Symmetry: D2
Subunit: 325 residues, 4 copies
Amino acid sequence: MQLGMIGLGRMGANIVRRLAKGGHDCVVYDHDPDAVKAMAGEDRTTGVASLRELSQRLSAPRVVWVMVPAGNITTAVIEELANTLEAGDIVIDGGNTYYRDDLRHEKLLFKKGIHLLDCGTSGGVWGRERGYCLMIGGDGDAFARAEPIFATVAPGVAAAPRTPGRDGEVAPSEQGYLHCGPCGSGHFVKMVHNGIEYGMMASLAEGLNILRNADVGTRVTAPLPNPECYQYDFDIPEVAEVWRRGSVIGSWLLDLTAIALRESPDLAEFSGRVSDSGEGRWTAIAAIDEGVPAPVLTTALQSRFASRDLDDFANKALSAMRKQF
Amino acid sequence: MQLGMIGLGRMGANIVRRLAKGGHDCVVYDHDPDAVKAMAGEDRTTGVASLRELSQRLSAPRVVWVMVPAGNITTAVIEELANTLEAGDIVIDGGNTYYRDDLRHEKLLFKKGIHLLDCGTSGGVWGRERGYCLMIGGDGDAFARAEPIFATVAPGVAAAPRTPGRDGEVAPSEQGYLHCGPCGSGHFVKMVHNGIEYGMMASLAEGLNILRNADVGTRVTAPLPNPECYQYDFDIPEVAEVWRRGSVIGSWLLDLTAIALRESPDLAEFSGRVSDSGEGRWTAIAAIDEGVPAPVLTTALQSRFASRDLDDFANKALSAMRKQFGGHAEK
Amino acid sequence: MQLGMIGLGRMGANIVRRLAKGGHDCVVYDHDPDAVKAMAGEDRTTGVASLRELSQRLSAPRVVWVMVPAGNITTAVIEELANTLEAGDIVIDGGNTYYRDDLRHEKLLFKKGIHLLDCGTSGGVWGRERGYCLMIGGDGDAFARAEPIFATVAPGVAAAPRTPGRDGEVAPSEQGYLHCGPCGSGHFVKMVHNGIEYGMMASLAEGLNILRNADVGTRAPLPNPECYQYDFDIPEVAEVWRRGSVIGSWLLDLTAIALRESPDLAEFSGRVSDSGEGRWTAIAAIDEGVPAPVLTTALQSRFASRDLDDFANKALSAMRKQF
Amino acid sequence: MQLGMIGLGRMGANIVRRLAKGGHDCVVYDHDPDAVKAMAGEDRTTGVASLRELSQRLSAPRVVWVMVPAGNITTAVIEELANTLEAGDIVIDGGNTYYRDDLRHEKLLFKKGIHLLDCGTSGGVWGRERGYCLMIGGDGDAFARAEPIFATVAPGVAAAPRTPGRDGEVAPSEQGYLHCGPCGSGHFVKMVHNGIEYGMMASLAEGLNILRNADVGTRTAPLPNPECYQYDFDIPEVAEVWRRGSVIGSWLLDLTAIALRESPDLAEFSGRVSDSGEGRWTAIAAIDEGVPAPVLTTALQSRFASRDLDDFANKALSAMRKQFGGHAEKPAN
């Protein structure tokens, strides 16, 4: 089965590799023409030179998948794609778009019979040999047409045991992809996956910090009562490892964290300045609009904010106040 | 090798059954003879009826494991194990003891030459099959002598693929045990293990709730701006399922969360009040003394408190303030 | 001078009665006739039953205060104030309008040349006497005209000793009112006033809660039950904190009242509403990358007090029921 | 009546001075020579430099106030006062002592017949003119005996209007001093008083920072609707406006107003914030008691990050963020 791909980075590319390698004709493209050549020289991949050439080098109805950076670069492509496509022609979007962005786009497209499918792509610099968890939202037939594509790019049921409970047969979710519901729905679930990520990383991270500083009763701000109760130097890299078998906080993020600490035992190569792509933020904003109390996820987000010195004016404020006493 | 076990509840019973089956001689004891009785028929196992009999039927040096209710039961046992065992003997506290409490137990035992190993014992009841992630603190030699036990209850390297970065032979951590350091350091890492568990769980929970209520535009206090954006009926169980492979948030908790949501889509039959160990509190008290920002871990802990209504006077003070300045009624 | 007024609840009515005693003419109206009845008797207060009767009663250029429930009911009165007014007419929105909806309300009255003064009104149900702290936005010159209103409902400088370093002439700020900037800027500052108000309330509430359970030893095992044997008299700590302490505040003063009436705050359920300004502040904060754990945590505590954690508590229970 | 003082920092002194004017006989001391000179040339004072000389210069039964640094030093001085004083006497520890320590100090001092009164003292430097909020614990009768000291060094009912509902005659509460209960009760309340301080300061600061950055729609995460965030607010004037007829009227607003008046970008100030320890204890009492205190505890945890104590954790996130999504740590602006 045949596909389009606008935008080719660390992701939009490694998509098309396990698309070909599975058994799919893929027809790639980009803005900076470097990415379109390297791909075109591998199994079942051809690098066109415009959005029109791609639609013409595909089967009607046409699947066309956009993994370009989010914001106004996404919007221009979708209002270009509008003129360069026809009816029956579904339009997957697997970049980090705000579920609400999708609402205006899918109206501009559902005008000219062009369909949108909001895709929640995750997996990263593993998603090629491990598969890319997708959370697709839109029309039920448009979805069904592409379902081939999605299975090829998911990790597949094999990736982990089936659910102690699922007797009978084996549904989308099990392999690693899901019609989440209508327009937005796709990206919405990706937001919250990211919410939980921040939360889950922060939990490990806070606990590891706790351990790292267990020795504060040797390293001698309040006057510490009971410095004998803080005399421990913890092999943080081994503690990370030990928790990998037979405990509860078993997780992919500890596996990576057990790596990163095997390589770099004091994570020196990282400064502290933690960026946030914006999906943490829209999860937090969702919670506040829904009246869902989410202090754990929203406080993981606020810790990143603080790690980039965005607490600055509040900190001057507190300093300026203490002086006045 | 040969071993003693005081306390035969679910946990202490299953350790002996992992140990005996893995070729270890296990002398058992409990307060409850019928409980002692259960571990007589079992291969390589043997009941007693006092702490002196125990140490007469155990070759010097002895290694006695204590798996009993934490606090003044752990203490009282250890206090007689000081009159029962001789010099050079070792006591394993696998219990859920406060590391600060191990600092008192260490000194009260080395005043009759008895080494105190503190073992932090995780896993649950799966641990009899899969093994118990262990965390052991105290004497480097006492550990070394007693290590064949820890290796045996441990899940073992087989349990998870080796870490990309571990070139060569198989280190103690990879078995699922570790000499974490001096006395108390096993219970300490164990504490923080639980803190993390509270954080990871809360992160999923809050997450699932944010899906649960995406439908908040459908039903219609704060005037929800742009309600049309919140009009989804999410299949939470499938969403939990799909994340299981190809996501970043893949975990044993997410697995259980997917099982739990399969059997009961809306968790309709479940409690709503969430209790807390105390390891979760200790972690938060640790983090404050060291000057470690632990907003995520602590706020998971205090979420638990708020679910047992423990935030109620605070709530009454907010409502009281509100009436004063705004004439605001409660709905 | 001469002023409109649409909505006569515990605020807008008590605004009028303050506006009056400082020699202003007021043209009241609210759905309920009985609402517009009571007022019609009070000084300089005129009981119409039509928006058009209202705008005919006013000597151009007009200025009309809108104090109605936020959301649709606010939009409804503003749309219909477009056709009820001409040009050079100022619309003072003193209700609890999301600043984003102020922008929409402004363009929609810039299409009849009607100035919007979005005014963040503070002070609650003490404001008839004590005055209302006010945070206005939109046009420098529309503000300029309405100014002598805004000083009347405000508390005036005399409400509190001048800031050390405040030399010379009493500024708008010091009188208890201020022009914050363009449209919205008024309701945006007020929004943030409420975010801070949530955090100050919660700071005291959580503190009182710690004292109330400091007797915890006399009833997750507690190490050292001898350290938790104090039965604090919360009414009296509240009152001692009023004089000579860092934490003196109006909210401490009101807390102190409430504990003198009700020492266990028995008549309050603890199910605590939030009216939207706390939420909009926390969204403003997330969008600007400003870390606000202390404010947002305080909001999340009101949600939890209404069982809005219920599904998550269920998830955690269901998880525990396995491992 | 007549009163001993040990320790003469920014606090020890200003109680002496306030009492003398209130008409009490002060006897003083603090190691440093010049500090004992400075107090000896004022009304009803008497700068000594033995502790034995001080208990001579005082008449039994006596009242000594202690205002030396918390921990080692304050315990040192209580041990030594166990010899120096005699039965029926009274110790006022007004230091930033931990309530758990007052319970040891009350045992020691009882095994020589003396009474401890623990006094939680607030106010700051303004308390010489204005007075100090005292929160006192200890033996009911030793309070009655020392009450006149407390009543003098407190601001008195005159400092604020009477609470509506307070009938009739002035309760001590209303003076700004309170017997909070038995030994420690006083320091404990002061402890929580400080937690609340952290909570109110954070709430003002986070607010100021939201105002500060309302301009972000003119100046990573893509910002939806940046037409929304185009405000350049006057933080010094908003701080000032809020002081009259609002809900967040407080001292700390008053101070923040002054600070922003002197310095409207707080540009000279560090943005590394200390905590003293009452805040840490308040957070730990709350955890011990199953009292959810996320607002106080986060105000606390916001100072720790302000001192790069979130360092390792941040590295862990950047370590995680790399491994999964080859995410790049963006440079230091």
